[PDB]
Amino acid sequence: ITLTYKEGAPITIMDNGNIDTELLVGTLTLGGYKTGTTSTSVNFTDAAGDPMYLTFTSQDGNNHQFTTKVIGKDSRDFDISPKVNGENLDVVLATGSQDFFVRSIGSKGGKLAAGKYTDAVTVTVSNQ
Amino acid sequence: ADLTASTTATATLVEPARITLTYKEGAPITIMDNGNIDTELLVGTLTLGGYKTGTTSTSVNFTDAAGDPMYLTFTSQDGNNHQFTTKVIGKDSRDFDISPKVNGENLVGDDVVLATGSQDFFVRSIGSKGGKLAAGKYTDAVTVTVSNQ
Amino acid sequence: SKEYGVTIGESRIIYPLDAAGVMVSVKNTQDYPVLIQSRIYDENKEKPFVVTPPLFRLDAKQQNSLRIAQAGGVFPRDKESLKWLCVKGIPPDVGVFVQFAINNCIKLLVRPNELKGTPIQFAENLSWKVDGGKLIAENPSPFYMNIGELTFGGKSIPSHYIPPKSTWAFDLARNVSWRIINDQGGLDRLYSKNVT
């Protein structure tokens, strides 16, 4: 199993200190799964462990955070929803590898400060 | 069986440089019985906004073609070149008089941090070195330059 | 009343010395079309880098992008150099009529690839002292330390950048508390030290 990431475009902080929804934060590329592996067998987890969301954090020590969701697309451009911290919110993945987009939801609270945000992610693939 | 892999997701958030200005005209100016426009009249009210908290008063500079340091000059449109000067001033937290640069120089007060969110400034009439102001339309094209931190 | 507004996609531009160019967005936040006039000035605001287009129309609520390109030239490689990018939005009894135009300027920081790290890694390195009746900041790093918040003895001091390997003197306790603005324009963490 291989898991890489490609950061998307910069995220513009709105005047109210929040960010917009559905923005493409980055792309997770999963590969090496057996033939027929489906979405429910994929589970992305991070430290925050918030069911259905990957939480990103500031590196300034103030712990500014925003949540995102993970959604992929099948051949008909329909949503592919893998488990994130054990929950969704079932489709067969593409042969070989599959891209999962990290879509923005919004600040976890308070105004966000500009800078670099990260989230140490782990993916567990079952029924392999 | 369960197979795993891990990686680091990253994101870069940015704060744009937003600047807005709102100008609310004051009451019309009436010429006195001796030919002078009054002084300290509220010609208009400027509300500068958008800037990030920390923006300073010395980083704002209102300029015009006349380029008179500390003053904004209004000229008649009748071709006779009648003029009167005005100043741009405001208040800080402790209600002390403050002022942004006007053609490169501050007229009053020390440099300060602008009010959070937005800052109001008032264009106040001074008078005119020439005097004898004729009725008519007076104008000025003013540029407001903000040098963000 | 009248309304004016000009937004630049970022509050500063980190320009990698010798890079081909960088893009930056400009948005006309108003209900009327305007002419966007972009100018580049030296560290002292006086007429190197080319902005394309130098002048173009931007319809209401619309956004577009400028390309800032380094046109040859030479810069020191032991420290950043500072320029300013100004984006001006040009709108279409004593009677008084005054017209305004917003000239939004941000720092264009030329950064040699030879420099390692970013401002945030050295923000704490500033030292302070009082002399000549002024608070003096000393920046030993090769980066412009763009203070976004400064406090001395509990009283706020209006910010200003501290040039690389140099100093800056502020007009006027022993405790100094400051926060620099990071490359993305965010207020970085707080630091404190007593004047020497």
UniProtKB/Swiss-Prot annotation, chain A:
It comes from the Bacteria. The keyword Signal applies. One of its GO terms (biological process) is cell adhesion. Transmembrane segments: none annotated. Keywords: Capsule, Plasmid, Secreted, Signal. Its main location: secreted. Residues 61-108 are annotated as: Contains potential antigenic determinants that may stimulate T-cells. Coiled coil: none annotated. One of its GO terms (cellular component) is extracellular region. It is found in: Secreted, Capsule. This is F1 capsule antigen. It comes from Yersinia pestis. The lineage of its organism: Bacteria, Pseudomonadati, Pseudomonadota, Gammaproteobacteria, Enterobacterales. The gene is caf1.
Swiss-Prot record, chain B:
It is found in: Secreted, Capsule. Keywords: Capsule, Plasmid, Secreted, Signal. One of its GO terms (cellular component) is capsule. The lineage of its organism: Bacteria, Pseudomonadati, Pseudomonadota, Gammaproteobacteria, Enterobacterales. Transmembrane segments: none annotated. This is F1 capsule antigen. Pfam families: Antig_Caf1. Gene3D superfamilies: Fimbrial-type adhesion domain. InterPro entries: Adhesion_dom_fimbrial_sf (IPR036937), Adhesion_dom_sf (IPR008966), Caf1 (IPR015335). Residues 79-129 are annotated as: Contains potential antigenic determinants that may stimulate T-cells. It comes from Yersinia pestis. GO terms for biological process: cell adhesion.
Curated annotation (Swiss-Prot), chain C:
GO terms for molecular function: protein folding chaperone. Transmembrane segments: none annotated. Disulfide bonds join 86-105. It comes from the Bacteria. One of its GO terms (biological process) is cell wall organization. It holds the Pfam family PapD_C. Keywords: Chaperone, Disulfide bond, Immunoglobulin domain, Periplasm, Plasmid, Signal. InterPro entries: Ig-like_fold, PapD-like_sf, Periplasmic_pilus_chap, Pili_assmbl_chap_C_dom_sf, Pili_assmbl_chaperone_bac, Pili_assmbl_chaperone_C, Pili_assmbl_chaperone_CS, Pili_assmbl_chaperone_N. GO terms for cellular component: outer membrane-bounded periplasmic space. It is found in: Periplasm. Has a stimulatory role for the envelope antigen F1 secretion. It seems to interact with the subunit polypeptide and to prevent it from digestion by a protease. Belongs to the periplasmic pilus chaperone family. This is Chaperone protein caf1M.
